[PDB]
Amino acid sequence: KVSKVVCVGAGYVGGPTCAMIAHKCPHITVTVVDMNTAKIAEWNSDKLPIYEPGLDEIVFAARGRNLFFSSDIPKAIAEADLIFISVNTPTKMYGRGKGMAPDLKYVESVSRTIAQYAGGPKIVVEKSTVPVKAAESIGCILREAQKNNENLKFQVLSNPEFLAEGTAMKDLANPDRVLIGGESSPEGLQAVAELVRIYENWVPRNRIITTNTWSSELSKLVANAFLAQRISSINSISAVCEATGAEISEVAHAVGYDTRIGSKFLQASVGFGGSCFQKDVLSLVYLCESLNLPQVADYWQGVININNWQRRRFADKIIAELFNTVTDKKIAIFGFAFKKNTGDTRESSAIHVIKHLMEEHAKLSVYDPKVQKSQMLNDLASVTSAQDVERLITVESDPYAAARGAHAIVVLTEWDEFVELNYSQIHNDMQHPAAIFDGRLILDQKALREIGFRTFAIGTSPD
Amino acid sequence: KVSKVVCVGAGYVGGPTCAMIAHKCPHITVTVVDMNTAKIAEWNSDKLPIYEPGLDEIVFAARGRNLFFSSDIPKAIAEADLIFISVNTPTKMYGRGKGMAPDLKYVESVSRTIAQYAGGPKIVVEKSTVPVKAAESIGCILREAQKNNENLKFQVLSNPEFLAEGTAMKDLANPDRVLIGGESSPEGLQAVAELVRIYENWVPRNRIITTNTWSSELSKLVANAFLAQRISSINSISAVCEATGAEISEVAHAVGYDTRIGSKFLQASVGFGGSCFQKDVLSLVYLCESLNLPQVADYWQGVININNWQRRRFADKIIAELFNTVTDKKIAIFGFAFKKNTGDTRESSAIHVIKHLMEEHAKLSVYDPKVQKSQMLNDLASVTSAQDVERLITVESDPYAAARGAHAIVVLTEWDEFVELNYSQIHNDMQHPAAIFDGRLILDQKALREIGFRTFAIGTSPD
Amino acid sequence: NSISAVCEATGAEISEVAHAVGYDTRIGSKFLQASVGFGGSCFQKDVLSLVYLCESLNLPQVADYWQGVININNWQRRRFADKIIAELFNTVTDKKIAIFGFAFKKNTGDTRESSAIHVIKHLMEEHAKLSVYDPKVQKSQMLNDLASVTSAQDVERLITVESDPYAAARGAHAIVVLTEWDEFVELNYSQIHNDMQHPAAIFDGRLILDQKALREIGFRTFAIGTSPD
Ligand SMILES: O=c1ccn([C@@H]2O[C@H](COP(=O)(O)OP(=O)(O)O[C@H]3OC[C@@H](O)[C@H](O)[C@H]3O)[C@@H](O)[C@H]2O)c(=O)[nH]1
Ligand SMILES: O=c1ccn([C@@H]2O[C@H](COP(=O)(O)OP(=O)(O)O[C@H]3OC[C@@H](O)[C@H](O)[C@H]3O)[C@@H](O)[C@H]2O)c(=O)[nH]1
Numbered sequence A, B: 001k002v003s004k005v006v007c008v009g010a011g012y013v014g015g016p017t018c019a020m021i022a023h024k025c026p027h028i029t030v031t032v033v034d035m036n037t038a039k040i041a042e043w044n045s046d047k048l049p050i051y052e053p054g055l056d057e058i059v060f061a062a063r064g065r066n067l068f069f070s071s072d073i074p075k076a077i078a079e080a081d082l083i084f085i086s087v088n089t090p091t092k093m094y095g096r097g098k099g100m101a102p103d104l105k106y107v108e109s110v111s112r113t114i115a116q117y118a119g120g121p122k123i124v125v126e127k128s129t130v131p132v133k134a135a136e137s138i139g140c141i142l143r144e145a146q147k148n149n150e151n152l153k154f155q156v157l158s159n160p161e162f163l164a165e166g167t168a169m170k171d172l173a174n175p176d177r178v179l180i181g182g183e184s185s186p187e188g189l190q191a192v193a194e195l196v197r198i199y200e201n202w203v204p205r206n207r208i209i210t211t212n213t214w215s216s217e218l219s220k221l222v223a224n225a226f227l228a229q230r231i232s233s234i235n236s237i238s239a240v241c242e243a244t245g246a247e248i249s250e251v252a253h254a255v256g257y258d259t260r261i262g263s264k265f266l267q268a269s270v271g272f273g274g275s276c277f278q279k280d281v282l283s284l285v286y287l288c289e290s291l292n293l294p295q296v297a298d299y300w301q302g303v304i305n306i307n308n309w310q311r312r313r314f315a316d317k318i319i320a321e322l323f324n325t326v327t328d329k330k331i332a333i334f335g336f337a338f339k340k341n342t343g344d345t346r347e348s349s350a351i352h353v354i355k356h357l358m359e360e361h362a363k364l365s366v367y368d369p370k371v372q373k374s375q376m377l378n379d380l381a382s383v384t385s386a387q388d389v390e391r392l393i394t395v396e397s398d399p400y401a402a403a404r405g406a407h408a409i410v411v412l413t414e415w416d417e418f419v420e421l422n423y424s425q426i427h428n429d430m431q432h433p434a435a436i437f438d439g440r441l442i443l444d445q446k447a448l449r450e451i452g453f454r455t456f457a458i459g460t461s462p463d
Numbered sequence C: 001n002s003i004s005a006v007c008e009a010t011g012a013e014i015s016e017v018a019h020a021v022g023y024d025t026r027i028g029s030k031f032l033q034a035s036v037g038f039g040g041s042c043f044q045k046d047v048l049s050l051v052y053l054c055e056s057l058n059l060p061q062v063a064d065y066w067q068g069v070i071n072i073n074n075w076q077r078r079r080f081a082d083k084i085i086a087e088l089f090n091t092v093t094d095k096k097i098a099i100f101g102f103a104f105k106k107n108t109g110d111t112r113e114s115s116a117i118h119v120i121k122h123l124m125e126e127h128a129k130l131s132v133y134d135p136k137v138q139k140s141q142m143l144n145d146l147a148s149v150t151s152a153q154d155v156e157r158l159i160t161v162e163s164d165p166y167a168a169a170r171g172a173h174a175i176v177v178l179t180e181w182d183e184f185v186e187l188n189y190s191q192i193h194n195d196m197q198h199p200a201a202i203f204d205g206r207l208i209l210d211q212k213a214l215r216e217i218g219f220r221t222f223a224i225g226t227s228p229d
């Protein structure tokens, strides 16, 4: 029976996951470790290294009791009964599968430390949002360790995470499902049962799916791709609505009435972001190519092609509607995170849209309620340059200051705060005529028009 | 208030729809008309021209009371309050959008007939499963008619049909949504109000969507495409399962637990059929190309590409597993309809699969519980030839006669009857070794393996 | 070499096929030894010279025919390096890989058109750190060869040359055999296995090692012309 859980990786996955375990399992001790010593110190402070609604209350109530953050990875490894691995698998920027395949270097190095410091039987659980052959590389390394020293009985399991950032605590406390994969053997079934037993402290058995290792990873890979496909499908139709005088919001509403389709994840946008979806579909495309399934690869590649096309055509419409010139024009950007209720900016559509406007020599004032300032500048500099950010980018802590004197507003993240702003007062303090471009479909187009905006929105005909 | 309903078109749409209207509206007289007087006679005989579960009880229940099938089109039109148009819009086999766009020649002719014989104000409602600009052509003709003879006050509505065949009576009685589009004017809103009034005799208000005409048609066109994309998405992953040793049934089960995705319409198959999905997706592709949106057109084209690829690779695997030769081998085919619980064969996957086996000079014995023999032979002759069908095709009324002496069984339609067969008796009376290929995932592979079959199924690795 | 891929895909052994093929005196039994690809200052230059002669004689069909000899050789080198990377979970980033052999064949210091150059470059482009041992090739010759296809700086950070095969293999994740030196047969592969990272992989591009013996030592062992199962 597991009573000591360790997780290597104190990120958006590892942190929240362990916090919920400690919150729901009083008799389990949870220790989170990370190579980043400064990041662990933040987890132990009153300002956590990430923003998640409800995370502070959960962590502060468990930290020091049964939830711990340490930088002594070997000590945690040695004392664990079960060890989560939740580290990066950054995409390969060279070689085979360049720009498509994950690089497993971190997963393997952690596995070697586990082999080096386990000192006894361990259950090792790979937990990420895009697992593709990651558990197989852990098992490869661990099997050898057992082979070389039979005192180290290791069972490797696959338990991908399903949380969405911004709703992580709600998702972790009441998941639609829990997916666990392991080898079909006596020791494998026992290890799965002990992980199931942990989740059964708060997850009903009928929502826990157990299978083999590869099925678990493939199901996660396919599930993520299905979600991205819904977004790209409704986004592709948003262009049809603009061209024919229909409203994508009405089309999505009518489509969702079919219970066979479902009504969720039919919200058009400037394009999906996040560390999961693009990496996931490209990983599926790369997997299919390596299996000699070109037909399949082409099918799923369309989800990425539409996403890139949606971002590009949105930025182009901004420029075209401003008479093809934004040179030296101040433009306010509402939103930088890839979705609301998070400070995470990985693969945010705001990065690509702002870059396009920078290439037009616009001066951009960006506001986001939660994204760190240094994070925005590093993101923008890595796609352009440090100098380009210095001349063109201004970061504001107040949306009215960003809009003051601006020629245009661009909404890129669906923060609820952006709905409740005083757009009448904003219109008085902008340059005239004032334009606004809604890339998230959260604003009242008719009301903005009556205020006097030249107003535009994805999925609405520009006239 | 409407009390006299006419529908021009006594097919799979017009017939069932009118039956349900009469069944739920005792005070409304519904007359179904059709150019085919022979088809009308079948509606008036004890063998209805289509098979739909529960349809026989309902028509029979009212055939003669308030529901009638007539061949006198002018008298029915002149006496009607509301007129459904549910006729064919066959795909163009030449000229612009050849093999992609519908031919509205019949819809137009019907509108002209209505104009000639209305003799008074009428509500005209275009009702089909793939509406694309059909209602606008009706209105173009009828608006002209009104202008010329002002006595004729016409209002054209779009009311797509949401039923799925095989479950038509249940769908018509409890639809997920009723979609109605109309002109935004006093007369337009009133015309919608009276059609909404009809459906409210048995459909709750919260499932009735009212919008403008074009929004109604685009919503139906997009909803069908979303449905087809789910099937193509799961079919593409079934090849990944075959290549990597996973089971598509397990993957689909795990995917469907996400309420954002939904668990329905994830059943893999040899490929989707029916007069709707392919016609609809190709119609969307053509619409996009016309709007200068190749990007969008290409995205949705992938749904068709996968469907063709799924049929092709399934037939290719059958031949490859029989050592690349089926010359003069008897092969039993279980299923010909495009889905279960219907006699409809339009765009059935069995047509293309049987054609592939015919080109390999196989002798095929086909059994389907409901498809007319003459229907199969005409379908197969139109893609090959009457002479080819004579030499290679045998139609059986008994599945055991089809399987007797066969080298292989190929399951193409998910009829419940195929599960409950005595596969021990079938195995004993087949050639040995006996092979079986499940293109619908309805059979127990382990059980077939235990009987002694060389057994295969889409989405299961063939070893 | 082209048939060696067919063996890998269907579970046959290229050594056995070559042995059976060579028993026909009309074919002859010599020169049927599979490899990562032929090298030397002669063959590639010669076939390319023959191809060019045929093009100038307006004999393209003939030119296309002989060009296939070069195409397969390049394809054999590329797919071998790709198999190394794919078998190591598609990542060799910063992994130490030992290279056994640099000369284009055994019993010479000549490196001209050696297949080892092309294979090492592919591993360099994957950011692997390569430790090279060859019994006769000059150290300066290897470094100049590798730098001329990549860059001097790339060679400085990624290439180290050893005078002892055990030093090259010490701490390595994989062994890659590229030249058929007899010395490589009689090495102590158990001691090498103990001093490598675990699990240890070995890729035989010359078909000189005993696969069954390497497997029993505990290697993940691979060889051109043997199915990796
Ligand atoms: O060797 C390592 C590598 C990485 N890490 C740590 O692992 C953590 C990774 O967390 P991140 O927030 O970067 O990523 P997430 O936890 O959100 O993971 C998610 O996105 C990145 C993808 O590669 C993962 O597959 C996915 O689960 C970092 O804090 C990093 O410091 C180690 O502790 N050791
Ligand atoms: O309807 C929608 C839904 C989502 N999106 C966008 O798509 C992106 C992803 O949004 P999600 O809510 O899925 O957030 P995440 O990317 O964190 O979660 C996703 O990846 C990790 C998996 O474990 C989750 O199950 C999956 O939802 C965001 O950029 C969001 O703005 C839309 O544009 N429209």
Ligand SMILES: O=c1ccn([C@@H]2O[C@H](COP(=O)(O)OP(=O)(O)O[C@H]3OC[C@@H](O)[C@H](O)[C@H]3O)[C@@H](O)[C@H]2O)c(=O)[nH]1
Pocket: B008, B009, B010, B011, B012, B013, B014, B033, B034, B035, B036, B039, B086, B087, B088, B089, B090, B106, B107, B109, B110, B127, B128, B129, B130, B131, B275
């Ligand atoms: O001018 C005409 C043409 C055709 N018809 C009749 O209308 C009936 C059409 O019924 P079908 O079963 O062929 O078609 P459905 O009712 O299933 O309609 C469905 O498939 C065909 C597509 O064109 C439609 O868009 C779709 O809704 C036929 O019986 C035909 O004889 C007329 O009454 N008048």
Ligand SMILES: O=c1ccn([C@@H]2O[C@H](COP(=O)(O)OP(=O)(O)O[C@H]3OC[C@@H](O)[C@H](O)[C@H]3O)[C@@H](O)[C@H]2O)c(=O)[nH]1
Pocket: B129, B161, B162, B163, B164, B165, B166, B224, B227, B231, B264, B265, B266, B267, B268, B269, B271, B272, B273, B274, B275, B276, B277, B338, B339, B340
């Ligand atoms: O999970 C599935 C679902 C369906 N299918 C196949 O897809 C094809 C379509 O079957 P449907 O159940 O959609 O039947 P229909 O085509 O008659 O109905 C469809 O078109 C008319 C619309 O009004 C309906 O809403 C739509 O479902 C069938 O061949 C079926 O076998 C699958 O292969 N897998």
Ligand SMILES: O=c1ccn([C@@H]2O[C@H](COP(=O)(O)OP(=O)(O)O[C@H]3OC[C@@H](O)[C@H](O)[C@H]3O)[C@@H](O)[C@H]2O)c(=O)[nH]1
Pocket: C030, C031, C032, C033, C034, C035, C037, C038, C039, C040, C041, C042, C043, C104, C105, C106
């Ligand atoms: O069976 C074999 C034989 C040779 N090879 C390779 O082919 C390449 C050539 O080796 P050789 O033994 O032909 O050596 P050389 O290239 O020096 O001689 C060759 O070119 C010069 C001519 O004069 C010689 O007659 C010719 O043999 C080497 O890379 C060798 O490893 C194989 O891969 N398999």
